[PDB]
Design a protein around this ligand. Structure first.
Ligand SMILES: C[C@@]1(c2cc(NC(=O)c3ccc(C#N)cn3)ccc2F)C[C@@H](C(F)(F)F)OC(N)=N1
Ligand code: NA
Ligand code: NA
Length: 376
């Protein structure tokens, strides 16, 4: 409890490619790098020699593999994967000292799923059964882990921004990973890690929208998405506010749609004309909320045509609701306290910043009528 030194720094990544953890599956163990994804619920690994892949699960070599004689076809907006369902022994070598029998989807066919040049070979879905595929009776990895061992029902993530690294503490919270206090928001329903946003300010100026707009039709915390993604109507307001905030410099109109990158010469990026962005989240007590504050450092992503510092705007519009992606998560230590159905935020010990402003987590604020903000 409180101290997990063998789990610190157990995540690796390349910028724009996600954060992965080393895992092993089968007997003898086969090592794979696996993307950590709080916005899905399948454990799925490549299992055939797709050319983008460093390595893949070879079921024939595992003496503990148990076939479920059952297929799954999983499309997303950015294409799909199909696989064969089975169970096998799974450990996390820089995780708890345990081995569990878990569902595995062995990916035999995929399109636009694996990244060419990436160093990972599957996805670890950490959200709940309700969105597991084919249906909610395919028990997710984390449910199997808690069912079979004494690991407590929680994990926390510190995603350190830009190559990338970080920590997944399975079973606990490590106090050296954050500063100040944790503040908790209720997980509104266990499917995605759904939360409720109650107010959004751009440089402390409120978007003043009916708050059902910030959660139309949900808001979720997702390490498997890069952007801060905002419902279209909120996106429009957000971006006009940021446009105005920084009319001091100018950039093309394409840039705010993530349709072109923009460029200042090495070390001339003027952070200080970009506003901070606060999100107030429903608190644990009636009429009480807290706010998290992020920086241009989180929303202007480094990309590496040009011999300069070029960034991409990584707030984007959405028709699936708000998505607090790695843009948000990289500022904070985030505790997925499944046992108490809540999610805690604290200032990350690692987050990228400058001399004037830092990411922040502050409370308590009085907000009335917060139950109006959930979309039904
Ligand atoms: C299952 C899915 C997914 C994620 C990624 N993620 C990444 O490639 C990635 C890349 C960079 C970073 C960072 N930082 C994080 N993730 C790639 C393929 C997928 F199918 C689908 C995706 C969907 F939105 F489609 F549902 O959202 C989530 N939550 N997971
Ligand atoms: Na248990
Ligand atoms: Na601390």
């Amino acid at each position: 409890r409180g101290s997990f030194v063998e789990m610190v720094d157990n995540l690796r990544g390349k910028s724009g490619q996600g954060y992965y953890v080393e895992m092993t599956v089968g007997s003898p163990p086969q090592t794979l790098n696996i993307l950590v994804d709080t916005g899905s619920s399948n454990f799925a690994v490549g299992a055939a020699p797709h050319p983008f892949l460093h390595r893949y699960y070879q079921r024939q070599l595992s003496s503990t593999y148990r076939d479920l004689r059952k297929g799954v076809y999983v499309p997303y907006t950015q294409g799909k994967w199909e696989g064969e369902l089975g169970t096998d022994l799974v450990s996390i070598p820089h995780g708890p000292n345990v081995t569990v029998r878990a569902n595995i989807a062995a990916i035999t066919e995929s399109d636009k799923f694996f990244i060419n040049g990436s160093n990972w070979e599957g996805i670890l879905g950490l959200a709940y059964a309700e969105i597991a595929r084919p249906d909610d009776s395919l028990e997710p990895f984390f449910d199997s882990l808690v069912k079979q061992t004494h690991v407590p029902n929680l994990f926390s993530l510190q995603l350190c921004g830009a190559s990338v690294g970080g920590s997944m503490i399975i079973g606990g919270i490590d106090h050296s990973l954050y500063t100040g206090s944790l503040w908790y928001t209720p997980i509104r329903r266990e499917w995605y890690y759904e939360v409720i946003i109650v107010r959004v300010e751009i440089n402390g100026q409120d978007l003043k929208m009916d708050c059902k707009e910030y959660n139309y039709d949900k808001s979720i915390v997702d390490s498997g998405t890069t952007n801060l993604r905002l419902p279209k109507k909120v996106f429009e307001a957000a971006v006009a506010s940021i446009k105005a905030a920084s009319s001091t410099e100018k950039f093309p109109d394409g840039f705010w749609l993530g349709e072109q990158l923009v460029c200042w010469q090495a070390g001339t990026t003027p952070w200080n004309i970009f506003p901070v962005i606060s999100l107030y989240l429903m608190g644990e007590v009636t009429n009480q909320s807290f706010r998290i504050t992020i920086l241009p450092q989180q929303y202007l992503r480094p990309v590496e045509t040009s011999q300069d510092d070029c960034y991409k705007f990584a707030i984007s519009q959405s028709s699936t609701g708000t998505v607090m992606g790695a843009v948000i998560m990289e500022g904070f230590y985030v505790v997925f306290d499944r046992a108490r159905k809540r999610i805690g935020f604290a200032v990350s010990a690692c987050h990228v910043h400058d001399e004037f402003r830092t990411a922040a987590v502050e409370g308590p604020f009085v907000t009335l009528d917060m139950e109006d903000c959930g979309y039904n």
